A paper describes a structure:
The TREX-2 complex integrates mRNA nuclear export into the gene expression pathway and is based on a Sac3 scaffold to which Thp1, Sem1, Sus1, and Cdc31 bind. TREX-2 also binds the mRNA nuclear export factor, Mex67:Mtr2, through the Sac3 N-terminal region (Sac3N). Whereas protein transport is generally facilitated by karyopherin-β family proteins, mRNA export in yeast is mediated primarily by the Mex67:Mtr2 complex or in metazoans by NXF1:NXT1 (Segref et al., 1997; Braun et al., 2001). Mex67 is a modular protein containing four domains: RNA-recognition motif (RRM), leucine-rich repeat (LRR), nuclear transport factor 2-like (NTF2L), and ubiquitin-associated (UBA).
Bacterially expressed ctSus1 formed a tripartite complex with ctSac3CID and ctCdc31, and the crystal structure of this complex confirmed that the appropriate Chaetomium genes had been identified. Crystalline plates of the C. thermophilum Sac3CID:Sus1:Cdc31 complex were obtained that diffracted to 3.3 Å resolution, and molecular replacement produced clear and well-defined electron density maps. After refinement, the model had a Rwork/Rfree value of 21.8%/27.7% and excellent geometry. Although its overall fold was similar to its S. cerevisiae homolog, the C. thermophilum Sac3CID:Cdc31:Sus1 complex had only a single Sus1 chain, whereas in the corresponding S. cerevisiae and GANP structures Sac3 bound two Sus1 chains, although only one of these chains appeared to be important functionally (Jani et al., 2009, 2012). In the C. thermophilum complex, the Sac3 helix also had a “kink” following residue 1,137, possibly as a consequence of the greater distance between the Cdc31 and Sus1 chains. The overall folds of ctCdc31 and ctSus1 were strongly conserved with their S. cerevisiae counterparts, with root-mean-square deviations (RMSDs) of 2.56 Å over 88 C-α atoms for Sus1 and 3.10 Å over 144 C-α atoms for Cdc31. The helical elements of the folds of both proteins were fully conserved, with differences concentrated in the loops joining the helices. Density for ctSus1 residues 99–139, as well as its substantially longer N/C-terminal extensions, was not present, consistent with these regions being disordered. Importantly, the extensive interaction interfaces between Sac3 and both Cdc31 and Sus1 were preserved. For example, ctSac3 Trp1161 was analogous to scSac3 Trp802, where it is a central feature of the Sac3-Cdc31 interaction and is buried in a hydrophobic cavity in the Cdc31 C-terminal domain.
Numbering used by the authors:
A (entry chain C): 13 to 96, 136 to 159
B (entry chain A): 6 to 176
C (entry chain B), D (entry chain E): 1090 to 1170
E (entry chain F): 13 to 99, 136 to 165
F (entry chain D): 5 to 176
Write the structure that this text describes.
């Protein structure tokens, strides 16, 4: 019930029509939660959260950030620098995301 | 943001000798290292000794704006705000600004809390007697009785915060 | 190929990886945030127990009590006629 | 009359009245002297324990300990080379 | 008994041999002790000792005097001068003096006799 | 006869350092609870004891009679006893100055030795240095304090006695 239509290949490709369509259909018989679950359970083994927490802690300890939203913005900004101890999410769970999302996206 | 800049002294100069002596006193107290320099937390304490309990944000702003790097730090590398220190000048200027910016009511509220330790909400004769015992000087009970009775407008047997502030700010 | 489409879908801008990492960071950071708060409570409490501070505090207390007590008694004496 | 002679003897220089007054003063004054010593011990004791002096004392102790401790440690590290 | 020498009347008179002689005779088969008793007993009622003690106290409390001998010399001088002026004063009351006259008189009457020229 | 009420000289107060003058003013202001700028006899005694002077009553009494000023409330037509006289800041400053400048440097050191060694053991050990470290608040590595003891322990007794303490603290 879903046609790729050359699938908008580039990782940077900015398509929201297809994305909101697929996401909307996918939300029915929700899969988002399955991905989230599998990912956390597969996210903790690599030892990333401790890195993140220690960084956030340092940020709070220095006193540079003094509110949770600011801490969130600061840290999300920091992790975002995947391209640059790295706060980048391990490639393993990315491959896992690829697998499970592919599997759950194959059905549609 | 401009950074490492020395703070202005204009708000420190208009102080009296007593105050300046108290600042220097606090500094010298918390200056255990004797290097004429304070750590961040020592500076926080120095301000807390003057009766300022500022939030981390404000002291951190002070830290980045007016914090000087330590000597041991290699100049070829960047220094984080937290590892910076305060000379006497910065502490003086900052404390001065803080003091002249201070609302006159704060010290009085603090004092009211010092007199009324039980948190009853008012100062009674007994409290004044305890404080008298703390000061060391013995005052006749007529005086303290007059200290309460003259300013008690409710006949409650003590003086509340409002009355304390009003009587203490009155000319 | 579906694999390419899912690749774009998951690691693209507004991808699943982004929403996920954002969410997990939100909750994780809240946890460590509360942790830091508790730690600060304890650190302040233990920091307060330092002697230098106790001295600064006591000295201040005494000074204030003296000042405002005698001021108060002065007002009282004035009104007493 | 004997009374005149007694008068000379008692109210004379080196009379019994003189030696008497001297002795009674000796003993009475020694008593009150020891008394005063004990009173001073207790009064000083009670005068010491209270705040103002305690603040001055604590301040003194701290200042001295700081000064000579760090001075000492300086000597030590200096000697360690 | 002892034959006397016409008593050298004026209180400030100089002869000291007769005085020490009389004292020597008096200490032997002691009578002096009676004087001491009668005097103490009659000295405490006028309330003089408390005054003396209080003065000594003031002197010690001020810190003006810091040794017992100095305290003694001071108080002795003080009573010397108050006694000089009298004719709260530390002068010894006249009552006990009169008492001294009486008791010393009886003792001397028993002990000695005074010849007549 | 004795001269009385005379003001004391500042010559011995002037050559002092800022620290000393400030500490004197601190002591004065501390024990000046009435805030009248004047001290009683005992308040002044305490002010001197705050500087670390345990003078005998005789000396402070001499100071009192020589440099004690009558209070204002006292009737000027009658004599006031020495004990009722008071000390302004100037007198306290002058007297304290003389006392400080005349004092031998060993006294403060002996006192300090008693402060470090409170148990009266006769020597200062590592534990004492550790306690003092705890009192000050600063944490120093045990190598330093171990060196603070060992470098100056000439007997191998496990501490530093008074003589050694003075000798080392007075050393150039």
């Amino acid at each position: 019930p879903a046609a790729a239509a050359n699938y908008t290949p580039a990782t940077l490709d900015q398509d929201l029509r297809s994305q909101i369509n697929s996401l909307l259909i996918k939300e029915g018989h929700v899969a988002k939660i399955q991905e989230h679950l599998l990912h956390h359970l597969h996210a903790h083994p690599s030892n990333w959260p401790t890195v993140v927490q220690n960084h956030a802690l340092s940020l709070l300890r220095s006193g540079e950030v003094t509110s949770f939203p600011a801490l969130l913005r600061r840290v999300v900004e920091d992790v975002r620098q995947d391209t640059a101890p790295s706060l980048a999410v391990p490639q393993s769970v990315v491959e896992e995301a690829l697998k499970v999302t592919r599997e759950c996206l194959d059905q549609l | 943001q401009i950074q490492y800049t020395i703070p202005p002294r204009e708000d420190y100069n208009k102080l009296s000798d007593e105050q300046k002596t108290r600042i220097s006193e606090a500094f010298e107290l918390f200056d255990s290292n004797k290097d004429g320099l304070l750590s961040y937390e020592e500076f926080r304490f120095v301000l807390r000794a003057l009766g300022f309990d500022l939030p981390k944000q404000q002291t951190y702003d002070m830290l980045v704006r007016h914090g000087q790097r330590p000597a041991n730090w290699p100049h070829d590398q960047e220094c984080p705000p937290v590892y910076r220190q305060f000379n006497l000048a910065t502490a003086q200027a900052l404390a001065g600004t803080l003091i002249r910016q201070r609302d006159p009511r704060d010290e009085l509220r603090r004092a009211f809390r010092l007199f009324d330790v039980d948190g009853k909400g008012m100062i009674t004769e007994d409290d004044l007697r305890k404080v008298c015992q703390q000061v060391g000087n013995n005052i006749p009970d007529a005086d303290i009785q007059a200290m309460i009775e003259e300013f008690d407008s409710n006949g409650k047997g003590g003086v509340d915060e409002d009355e304390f502030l009003r009587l203490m700010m009155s000319k | 190929l579906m694999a390419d489409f899912t690749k774009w879908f998951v690691t693209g801008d507004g991808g699943i990886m982004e929403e996920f990492t954002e969410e997990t960071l939100r909750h994780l950071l809240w946890d460590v945030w509360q942790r830091h708060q508790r730690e600060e409570a304890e650190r302040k409490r233990k920091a307060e127990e330092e002697e230098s501070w106790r001295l600064a505090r006591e000295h201040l207390t005494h000074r204030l009590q003296v000042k405002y007590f005698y001021r108060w008694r002065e007002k009282a004496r004035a009104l007493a006629t």
